[PDB]
Amino acid sequence: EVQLVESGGGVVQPGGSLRLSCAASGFTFNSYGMHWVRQAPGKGLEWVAFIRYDGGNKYYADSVKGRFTISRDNSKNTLYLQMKSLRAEDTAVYYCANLKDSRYSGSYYDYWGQGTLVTVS
């Protein structure tokens, strides 16, 4: 009954830009701090970004700190990832995650997205 449908994947020239969107509908949203997680094809899961319940504090991974920005729109219940200056090491499957934290976000349920294939060629 939870729905995290994501969009914005496609062929991107190196050094381009994207807006990955995650439409969330089901749980209450905006009471949970939500995450962007990515998985390289054939590799393990990495971590991209985290945003709090009010859009106040945003935290990024130590490799992409500055090329990505994470935002949320609580009126339409969406997550956004602005990706600028993409290299070829960012072709991946991006999931829109709500991790069963319990230290920072304080969530209790694990709701994952579906994942968009962002191919940077």
């Binding site: 500055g66 602005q82 600028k84 200056s85």
Partner: protein, 49 residues
């Protein structure tokens, strides 16, 4: 309400009331430089016969 919070009142009479400041932040963040002249060859020290 912005104006109310500014005049510290609940009644705002008629007129232009300056409240806040609108600065537009930036987006990207480039870092340009020159190409690359000499390259001090490790080609000769790591790869001698």
């Amino acid at each position: 309400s912005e104006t109310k919070c500014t005049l510290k009142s609940f009644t705002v009479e008629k007129g232009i009331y300056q409240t806040s400041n609108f600065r537009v932040q930036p987006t990207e963040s480039i870092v340009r430089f020159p190409n690359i002249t000499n390259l001090c060859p490790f080609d000769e020290v790591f790869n001698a016969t």
